[model samples]
Target: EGVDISPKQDEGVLKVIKREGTGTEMPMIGDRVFVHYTGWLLDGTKFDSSLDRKDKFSFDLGKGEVIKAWDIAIATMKVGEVCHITCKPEYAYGSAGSPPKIPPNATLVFEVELFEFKGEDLTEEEDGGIIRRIQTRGEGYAKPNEGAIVEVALEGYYKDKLFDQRELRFEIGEGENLDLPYGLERAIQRMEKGEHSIVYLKPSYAFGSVGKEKFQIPPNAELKYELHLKSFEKA
Candidate 1:
C-alpha cells in the first residue's frame, strides 16, 4: 500500500481509481446509490467493510448519512467506479471516534465501489417541461429499461378538474402507439417498479393545442398527474 500519499486529489480528499466506471452519469440528491466499501485506519488496520458481509450498501446521496468526506467524495464518483480515497480526520470521524474499531481523530482510508444508482423521484423544472416527485419509494434497485413492458395506473387532472383515470400497460418506447403522452413515458423511464410519482406537465407535452372536448379540456392547458408504476417485466 506504499505509494505517493500526499495531497493527491485535493485537500483532505485524496483518491485514486483502481477501476473504471462504465457510465458518465452522476447521482443527484435524494437519489439512492448502492456501493460496496472497505475502510481502514492510517496504519492499515481494517476497520469496517460492507463487502465482508457480502451485502451491498445503499444511501441517499447528499444527505449526510456518512462522514463528511464520504458525502463529498462519493458525490464525485461515477457508477461502476472503484476508488480508493484517503481522508484526514477532519473529514472523517473528527474529534469523536467510532468505538470498537476506530480511535478518536484517526486519519482514515476507504475503498468504495459504486455500482448502481437511481435518481431521486423529485425533479426540478426541465427544459422538456417535466417536473416529477415520487409519491412512494420503489422496493428494489430495478428500473425498467428499453423493451420493458410496464403496467401503470394514472389519474390525470386539468387544473382543479379530474379528467382521466385509467390503468394501462405498455412498453417503454411505444408510448406514442398507446396514446400515452411523451412526458409520461419519458418520466416513467426514470421511475422504479412500484414507485408512485406525480408529474407536472405543460400543455405542449400533454394533449398539445388540440385539447380534448370530451374531457372539457382547453387549448394550451397545463396538467398534473398522480401516477403509479404497478410493475414491470422484460419484453
Candidate 2:
C-alpha cells in the first residue's frame, strides 16, 4: 500500500509582536501637549523625524485636532515614551504626490516618540515666529529665543481608496533640512523650548491660498496643528 499524496511539514509566516508603551495620556477637549516622532515607508525609506532637527511638536487631543490617524493615536501615548505605528494607504496619500520621493498609492509606517509635554502657552512675545490661531483646536506659540524645538508624529490621510499608509516623521529646527516655509520658520522662532500650543492655520498659513490639485484642502480652509516644545539644545 502506498500513500496517494505526500507533503512536508511547513510553517507558514512570521508573527511580529509590535511594541508600545502601556500608559496612555488622554487629553481633554482643550488639552494640548508636545511630541516627537519618525516616519518612513515600508521599504525602509525615511520620510521625516522630529528628532533629526531636535524639534518638538504640539497639538490638542480631542478637538478635530489633527489627521484622523493622529487624532486617534495620540490619545494612546504617554510622555517620555515611544512606539511603532503601521498605517494603510487610505490613511496616507492616495494617488498623488511629487512621485519618487513619495510615490502615489503607498503604505506607510512610523516610529513615534513622545518625549515631553506641556499644557498651554504663558508668554505674550509676538514676533515673526509667533504662532497664530485660525478656527480649530489650535493656539499661537513659538518663541525661539527661549529655546526652539518641536517634535511631532503625524500621518497624512489622502483621498485615495486603497493601499496602506501615509505616515512620515521628522524633527523641526534641528537641521533636518526640511523645507519649512518662511512664515512657519518665523512662527517657530516665536516659540520657547518648553511651550505647548495648538496652531489653527488657514490655508494661507499652510500651503498658501492656492493649495494643491492633488491634496486640495479648499481655499481659506482652517487646519489644526499640535505643537510641543520638548528639550532644547544646550547653549
Candidate 3:
C-alpha cells in the first residue's frame, strides 16, 4: 500500500520502491540536492550507477544537468526516499540518443535515493535579473553597505568559455567607468568580506541585447560569474 506509482506531468512515470524518509520537505528549484542512483535500459541491462564509483551526485534541482524525467521525479520525493522512475525518449535523451550506451529513442529506468539538500535565502537586487549562490559563506551575516570600497576577484563564463578573469577594486554602490556589468556590481553588495559565490545573470543584467562585439559574446547571452570578495571597508 506504500508504493507510489504515478504518471508525471506529461513526461514519464515514477514508482516508489522505498519510503523511509526523515522529513516531509521536498526540494525546490535552486536547492542543491545530493543523490545516489543507478540507471538501466529496458530488458534490465544496467547502464550506469553512482554507487559503483562510491560517489554521490549533487546538483541544483532545476539546473538542466540531468534528464528531465529525473528532475520531475526527484521533486516529488523527500530526503532518504528511494524510487524507480521510467523515462520515455522525449524525457531521456531524445532522438539523438547518448550514442553507444543508449540507442536512438531509447527508454530508460533509474533507481534513485535522495540523501540531503541545502538552500539559500536570496533576495533580488534593485536592478533585477541576477541570482547568487554562496560557495564560501560569510560571517555574522555581513554585507557591504552603499559606498563601501570592496576588493574582489571575478571570473566570467559563457557557453563554457572563460571570457574574463581579474582582480577588481570598486565602490559598492557606484564607480565611474568601471566597465563591470550591472549584475556583477549588484552581486558584490550582497557579499561580505572574505565570502565567495557564483552568480547567474540574465542578458539584461549582463551585456544586454548589444553584446560586447570585441569579446565575441553573442547577444542576449546568459552569464555565470565566480566572485570572491577579498576585503571591504567603508569609504
Quick one: best lDDT, which candidate?
A: 1
| TM-score, per-candidate, Cα-based | 0.51, 0.39, 0.50
Taking every candidate in turn, the Cα RMSD to the unseen true structure, in Å, is 14.9, 22.0, 15.1
lDDT of 1 by residue, 21-122 (tens): 886666665667899999988788999999767679998876889777877777778898988888888788877788779999887889999988764443
lDDT of 1: 0.78
| Model number with the top TM-score | 1
**For candidate 2, lDDT tens digit of each residue in 61-155?**
65665544455455556665565656545444656833667678766666666655434332244222224432223243433432334443222
Model 2: weakest 10-residue lDDT segment is: 4-13
For residues 106-188, write the lDDT of model 3, one tens digit per residue.
88888899998765434454343777766666665567777888888988899899988889887876643565787778778
What are the clash counts of all predictions, listed in order? 0, 44, 0
RMSD of 2: 22.0
**Cα lDDT listed for each candidate:** 0.78, 0.47, 0.77
TM-score of 3: 0.50
lDDT score at residue 220, model 2, on the 0-100 scale: 48
- Name the candidate, 1 or 3, with the larger TM-score value: 1
